[PDB]
From TrEMBL, chains A, B:
<dbReference type="GO" id="GO:0046872">
    <property type="term" value="F:metal ion binding"/>
</dbReference>
<feature type="binding site">
    <location>
        <position position="55"/>
    </location>
    <ligand>
        <name>heme b 6</name>
    </ligand>
</feature>
<feature type="binding site">
    <location>
        <position position="55"/>
    </location>
    <ligand>
        <name>heme b 8</name>
    </ligand>
</feature>
<feature type="binding site">
    <location>
        <position position="36"/>
    </location>
    <ligand>
        <name>heme b 4</name>
    </ligand>
</feature>
<comment type="similarity">
    <text>Belongs to the globin family.</text>
</comment>
<feature type="binding site">
    <location>
        <position position="89"/>
    </location>
    <ligand>
        <name>heme b 7</name>
    </ligand>
</feature>
<feature type="binding site">
    <location>
        <position position="89"/>
    </location>
    <ligand>
        <name>heme b 3</name>
    </ligand>
</feature>
<feature type="binding site">
    <location>
        <position position="89"/>
    </location>
    <ligand>
        <name>heme b 12</name>
    </ligand>
</feature>
<feature type="binding site">
    <location>
        <position position="89"/>
    </location>
    <ligand>
        <name>heme b 1</name>
    </ligand>
</feature>
<feature type="binding site">
    <location>
        <position position="89"/>
    </location>
    <ligand>
        <name>heme b 2</name>
    </ligand>
</feature>
<feature type="binding site">
    <location>
        <position position="89"/>
    </location>
    <ligand>
        <name>heme b 8</name>
    </ligand>
</feature>
<feature type="binding site">
    <location>
        <position position="58"/>
    </location>
    <ligand>
        <name>heme b 7</name>
    </ligand>
</feature>
<keyword id="KW-0561">Oxygen transport</keyword>
<feature type="binding site">
    <location>
        <position position="88"/>
    </location>
    <ligand>
        <name>heme b 7</name>
    </ligand>
</feature>
<feature type="binding site">
    <location>
        <position position="55"/>
    </location>
    <ligand>
        <name>heme b 9</name>
    </ligand>
</feature>
<feature type="binding site">
    <location>
        <position position="55"/>
    </location>
    <ligand>
        <name>heme b 3</name>
    </ligand>
</feature>
<feature type="binding site">
    <location>
        <position position="88"/>
    </location>
    <ligand>
        <name>heme b 11</name>
    </ligand>
</feature>
Amino acid sequence: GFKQDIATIRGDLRTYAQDIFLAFLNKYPDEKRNFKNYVGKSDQELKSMAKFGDHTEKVFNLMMEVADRATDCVPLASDASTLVQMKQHSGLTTGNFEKLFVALVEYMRASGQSFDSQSWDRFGKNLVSALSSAGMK
Amino acid sequence: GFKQDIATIRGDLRTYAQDIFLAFLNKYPDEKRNFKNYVGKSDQELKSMAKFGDHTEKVFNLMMEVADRATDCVPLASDASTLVQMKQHSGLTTGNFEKLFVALVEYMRASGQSFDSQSWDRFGKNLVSALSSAGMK
Ligand code: HEM
Ligand code: HEM
């Protein structure tokens, strides 16, 4: 289920974070508007970039904590406020987060593994609602 | 406290895992008998090896899960058995883990951060006696 998936991702976080983030960027190429240092590079080139590895790790480290702190896939208000008020998230709207989780759930559904895809869909939709409530457009 | 330290470490897991694992190897150089592939390499060389970082990341993820599951810094007997029964752990005594946590606590005390060093000291002692219970010599 959802709690076990959190442990699965944490067990190999580097690989999942990189693979899921790449699925996001390849499914929604226009999202590189936000990460212009990743333009013009293949997956293998991104995976050898220090900055890419560090960013994906810290994103998914934090995403797994937000997931771990949720109840029934509903994230804490404090966690959403953190995400809205991060300096690095200044320009973003909820549609950006929706697309990350669409790609994440698609990655799980295409995986050989028994991820609780439906739970992560709910988590994504509940996080977006939480971010709206904390002020994200 | 202990719970917040878990979140602090998870937030930047690979960086804390490498620094702590390095402080352990450097405090107890004999312990490299167990990691032959790290012999003859400075900290910076080890930090450049993807395999070194992958190992430290998986170790400290599991350590943070055993920590998160503990009650009042008392690990589950089941986790202690898992760590004894791992094949990679075949032939270790509790002195090996005792030394890891001494280096971990010393690292925290020297940090400029308000880690709850005493809790980690107790978690390490309680893990060591739990590995003893679960059959480690
Ligand atoms: C959904 C869960 C998300 C989490 C947990 C998360 C977390 C993070 C973290 C930890 C950082 C690093 C901040 C630092 O270095 O202190 C970061 C940076 C950043 N995030 Fe996110 N983020 C999420 C979603 C998104 C989305 C959907 C976008 C855009 C589509 C985005 C855009 C950015 C940008 C542009 C930066 C910093 C610029 C850079 O990479 O140098 N984030 N985020
Ligand atoms: C709470 C403490 C510890 C935890 C959570 C832990 C966890 C792990 C994990 C998850 C792995 C597998 C990593 C992978 O799959 O890549 C591993 C491997 C290993 N561990 Fe530990 N460990 C701990 C303490 C120790 C100590 C104190 C020693 C020896 C001083 C040790 C010796 C080893 C060795 C030799 C390997 C195999 C390394 C290799 O294949 O290159 N472990 N440990």
